[PDB]
Amino acid sequence: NTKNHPMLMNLLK
Amino acid sequence: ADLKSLAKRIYEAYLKNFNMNKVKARVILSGPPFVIHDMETLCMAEKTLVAKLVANGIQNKEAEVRIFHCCQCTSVETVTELTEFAKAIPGFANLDLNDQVTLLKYGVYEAIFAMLSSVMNKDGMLVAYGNGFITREFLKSLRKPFCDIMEPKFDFAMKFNALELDDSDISLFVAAIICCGDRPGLLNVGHIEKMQEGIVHVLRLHLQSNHPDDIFLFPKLLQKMADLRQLVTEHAQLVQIIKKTESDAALHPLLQEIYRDMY
Ligand SMILES: CC(C)(Sc1ccc(CCN(CCCCC2CCCCC2)C(=O)NC2CCCCC2)cc1)C(=O)O
């Protein structure tokens, strides 16, 4: 769930 | 598919993305790092290794809360290293981003506690980018609940270390931890299960090659994965108790995001 994990999303981006 | 080559790519990604590897840690743990074995040496180590933390400011917080803050910083750094490693695992970057997030959320602490074994011996652990060593007895001496955090990790580590794995093995074990198709809430379960089967097969063949003396090493490692899931579920419960009952122990936002709705 990208919406609930913006900080992990940013690391992945 | 070239499984020796997949193993090598994963090993190279692990050497590239983690600042600490097992050969390095053993070079240091032989012989020098600054030894934290009591409150005097904790305070000296803070002034040499984390100077900003105690340049006034939380310098007046309890030693346990200062240590806990430093541990949160280290976990934040390790999650970043694990994310870079995951992106280099063949196939991970082709997954849906929602699934990449889910696999990281559930896998990172299992991988952290596996990798923590490489810097532990029965007397303590190498910390601060190889520049400090904090004794197991010092950690047990902290007030509750903070003395309860590390001891189960040392217990896991002593038996994990007895398997005598090297970095070529551990890299594949960490990849297998991450590429797990039974995490809650995956979208493309079948794709992830096939990726898991592939990584696990790479691990099985590698252990046959690298550890011909130990015919049970693969099922031993499957059991260690299950032990790590349990260790993380318990750790998450303890972190919840700390965050809820200790006001100077608020969680860093990246860690809160990982633990939120985890177990
Ligand atoms: C932070 C929680 C909320 S609880 C938790 C989780 C993990 C740990 C182990 C942290 N640590 C000691 C870091 C000790 C720093 C030292 C303190 C004394 C003054 C000098 C600096 C360390 O070396 N970790 C390795 C990193 C290399 C790769 C493997 C892991 C401790 C507590 C979390 O769940 O994240």
Identity of the amino acid at B211: H
Structure tokens at B110: 């299992």
- CA distances B105 to B5, B81, B121, B123, B219, Å, are 28, 14, 28, 31, 25
Q: Which CATH architecture has domain B2-263?
A: Orthogonal Bundle (1.10)
Sequential DSSP letters for B187-198: S-HHHHHHHHHH
CA distance A7 to chain B (A): 6
Identity of the amino acid at B218: F
Which residue's alpha carbon is at the smallest distance from atom 31 of ligand 1?
B71
What size, in residues, is chain B? 263
Interhelix angle B3-17/B189-210, nearest 10 degrees: 90
Which residue's alpha carbon is at the smallest distance from atom 32 of ligand 1?
B71
Sign of the torsion formed by the C-alpha atoms of B147, B34, B167 and B72: positive
Give residue B7 CA to ligand 1 midpoint distance, Å: 28
Structure tokens at B237: 């419960």
CA distance A9 to chain B (A): 7
DSSP summary character for residue B33: P
Cβ pair B123, B213 in contact under 8 A: no
CA distance B253 to B28: 32
CA distance B190 to B188: 6
Kind plus residue range of the DSSP H or E element containing B34 = strand B34-36
Identity of the amino acid at B240: Q
Sequential DSSP letters for B111-179: HHHHHHGGGEETTEEEETTTTEEEEHHHHHHSPTTGGGSSHHHHHHHHHHHHT---HHHHHHHHHHHHS
Which residue in A3, A8, A7 sits closest to B104, CA to CA? A8
All residues of chain A having their beta carbon less than 8 Å from the beta carbon of residue B97 are: 2, 9, 12
Q: Are strands B132-135 and B34-36 parallel, antiparallel or unpaired?
A: parallel
B149 lines ligand 1 (CB under 6 A): yes
Cβ pair B134, B127 in contact under 8 A: yes
Kind plus residue range of the DSSP H or E element containing B35 = strand B34-36
Cβ pair B246, B65 in contact under 8 A: yes
CA atoms within 13 A on the CB side of B121: 11
Experimental method: X-ray
Resolution (A): 1.4
Measured distance between the N- and C-terminal CA atoms of chain A, rounded to whole angstroms? 14
All residues of chain A having their beta carbon less than 8 Å from the beta carbon of residue B83 are: 8, 11-12
CB atoms within 10 A of CB A7: 17
Contact B87 A9 (CB under 8 A): no
Sequential DSSP letters for B210-259: H-TT-TTHHHHHHHHHHHHHHHHHHHHHHHHHHHHH-GGGPPPHHHHHHH
> Listing from the earlier edge strand, what are the strands of the sheet with B120-121?
B34-36, B132-135, B124-127, B120-121
SS3 B94: helix
Mutate to test the interface with B, among A5, A9, A13 (most CBs of B within 10 A): A5
Sign of the torsion formed by the C-alpha atoms of B38, B44, B48 and B53: positive
Atom of ligand 1 nearest to the CA of B81: 28
Which residue in B236, B7, B20, B216 sits closest to B128, CA to CA? B20
Cβ pair B50, B140 in contact under 8 A: no
CA distance B24 to chain A (A): 26
Contact A12 B101 (CB under 8 A): yes
CA distance B105 to B175: 14
